[PDB]
Amino acid sequence: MAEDQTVLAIDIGGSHVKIGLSTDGEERKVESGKTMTGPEMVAAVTAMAKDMTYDVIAMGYPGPVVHNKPLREPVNLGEGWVGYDYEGAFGRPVRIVNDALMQAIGSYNGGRMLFLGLGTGLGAAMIVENVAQPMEIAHLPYRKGKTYEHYVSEAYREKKGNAKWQKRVQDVVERLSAALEPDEVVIGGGNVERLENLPPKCRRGDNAMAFEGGFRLWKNADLIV
Amino acid sequence: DQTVLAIDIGGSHVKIGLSTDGEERKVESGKTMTGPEMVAAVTAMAKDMTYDVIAMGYPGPVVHNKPLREPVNLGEGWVGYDYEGAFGRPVRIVNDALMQAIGSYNGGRMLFLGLGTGLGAAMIVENVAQPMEIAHLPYRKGKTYEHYVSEAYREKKGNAKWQKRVQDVVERLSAALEPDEVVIGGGNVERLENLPPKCRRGDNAMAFEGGFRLWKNADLIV
């Protein structure tokens, strides 16, 4: 039964690989960094989890994913992630989604929800009527000369300050909301603690929602995607 | 028993097909066509047809039936537009490559590549269809996937070189995604000659079939 599986959720980022079990939610982590390869991640997780019991794995991957297969190598990690046999390497079934999609799933409380992930990269996902869809917005033109990701970068924040960057984040939220008509917008990623005063229909996601999204990916049978 | 009007929106024409008798019509679109202009053009072109619902294949990224980006090769006013109200019918919208993929699907793990002005892709596994955006992804030598397989590349470099690049892209995507088969469609499918094993030539009529399936197929997910 899908609902009964014990899940090991893996949140992969440019700084750490974080893991947690559905049976307790307790986090362990190890450094990743710019050279960590796919195989190196698997070996690091396996070692971290050596005294844990898990049936299945859910992985939140910092790049595009199609049907549990990474499509692109990670921007801020090493190579060897695309085409790798994660299921054989872990010796367990594995589901893999883009990292923003995983946090979106964990944040979902019903209806039409847009998730915006303010991390090293700009991520997004949307869930409607329990159907979750990943999005790629980082490369889209916000205006001529300027992609969405460039428009809200940490580089801009460290230059012009929290107040002006927050206004640019609000601009992005308004533009996506006009396109997609969500009931609510959840803002997560590591940078979400940097935002002061959210507009109506907006809430802060908690980082715990990455693991919860991983647990849901297997255990919640109302989820499509 | 719903009758579906499938709309295949491209840079040169908007083509429609009706599920009940498979009749096909077309009219020119062009570089400045707006969303509202498309709806008016389609409604006039389909004036004497009876249709219950609409399936639209949009030349851009779509999220839960809503266009995410204005089309690269058409005009503006597509994002945020109330298609359902403008048509007076229920409307489902997916990316153009996804609709053709849906129409081409015969089971198993199928990767679809659409070769036209640009590069589209979608993948279906066990009746679950997922759109892909590969055009902007890095391929080689600081160039994207779409750079090597675009109509621009074919016209400049010749059919022989272009076909080899298409082959390379299919091999790279196949190694990433492990499909059982690869279906190649789009306006340039007829320019490919000697397809490798596991690769088959799509039929562009499958755009309409995909639209019909988006409403009528009881197993399709997405």
String of DSSP letters for B177-205 = H--SEEEEESTTGGG--SPPTTEEE--TT
Strands B181-185 and B66-67: unpaired
Burial of B179 (0-12, 13-18, 19+ CB in 10 A): buried
**Phi, psi dihedral angles at A92 (to 5 degrees):** -145, 155
B221 in the same domain as B131: yes
What is chain A's Cα-based Rg? 17
Residue identified by tokens 């090991």 is A8
Q: Write down the H helix ranges in chain A.
A: 38-48, 86-90, 99-107, 148-151, 154-160, 162-180, 209-219
Task: Tell me, yes or no, if B177 comes closer than 8 A to chain A by beta carbon.
Answer: yes
Q: Burial code of A105-143, b = ≥16 C-beta within 10 A, e = fewer?
A: bbbbeeeebbbbbbbbbbbbbbbbeeebbbbbbbbbebe
Closest C-alpha to A34, from A95, A71, A66, A75: A75
**Do B79 and B167 lie in a common domain?**
no
Nearest CB neighbour to A136, from listed B67, B80, B133: B133
- Whether chain B has a CB inside 8 Å of the CB on A64: the answer is yes
A163 interfaces chain B, CB cutoff of 8 Å: no
Is B117 found in the same domain as B77?
no
Range of the domain at A166: 99-225
Residues B131 and B211 in one domain: yes
**CA-CA-CA-CA torsion sign (A205, A206, A208, A210):** positive
The CATH number given to whatever domain includes residue A9 is: 3.30.420.40
Q: Report CA-CA distances (Å) from B189 to B112, B116, B162.
A: 12, 8, 12
User: Are residues B183 and B143 part of one domain?
Assistant: yes
Which of B92, B177, B180 is the best substitution to test chain A (most A C-beta atoms within 10 A)? Answer: B177
Distance CA A91, CA A207 (A): 28
Of B61, B128, B175, the CB nearest to A83: B175
- How many angstroms separate the CA atoms of B161 and B149, rounded? 10
Pick from A194, A21, A213, A27: nearest CA to A118? A194
- Chain position carrying tokens 């992804």: B137
The verdict on a CB contact (< 8 Å) between B68 and A133 is: no
Indicate if A180 and A92 belong to the same structural domain: no
Residue of B105, B111, B133, B172 to mutate, testing the A interface (most A Cβ within 10 Å of its Cβ): B133
| Domain end call among B63, B95, B127 | B95
Domain end, chosen from B95, B112, B138, is at B95
* Cα A164 to Cα A156: distance, rounded to the nearest angstrom: 9
The candidate with the shortest Cα–Cα distance to A104, out of A129, A120, A122, A123, is A123
Closest CA to A169 of A103, A99, A122: A122
Whether residues B67 and B91 share a domain: the answer is yes
Here the tokens at position B93 are 């919208």
Are A82 and A103 within one domain?
no
Residue type, A11: D
Residue type, position A76, single letter: N
Distance CA B117, CA B131 (A): 18
Q: Which residues pair with A27 in a beta bridge?
A: A20
A126 and B80 within 8 Å at the Cβ level: the answer is no
Which DSSP helix (H) or strand (E) runs through B129?
strand B128-132
Q: Tell me the pairing of strands A56-61 and A94-98.
A: parallel
Cα distances (angstroms) measured from residue A111 to each of A184, B26, B100: 8, 38, 29
Q: Is the domain of B90 the same as that of B100?
A: no
Domain identity same for B88 and B173: no
Nearest-angstrom CA–CA distance, A110 and B16:
35
A57, β-bridge pairs: A8, A94
Contact A43, A19 (CB under 8 A): no
Method: X-ray
What's CA B190's distance to the chain center, in Å? Answer: 16
Residues A135, B51: Cα–Cα separation, whole Å: 31
**Domain count across chain B:** 2
Q: Which of B40, B63, B95 is the last residue of a domain?
A: B95
Is residue B89 located within the same domain as residue B29?
A: yes
Q: Do A71 and B136 touch (CB under 8 A)?
A: no
CA–CA dist B166, B185 (Å, integer)? 12
A138 touches chain B (CB under 8 A): no
Return the HEC string of A158-224.
Answer: HHHCHHHHHHHHHHHHHHHHHHHCCCEEEEECHHHHHCCCCCCCEEECCCCHHHHHHHHHHHCCCCE
Query: Cβ contact (<8 Å) for A180 and B132?
Result: no
In terms of domains, do B218 and B157 share one? Answer: yes
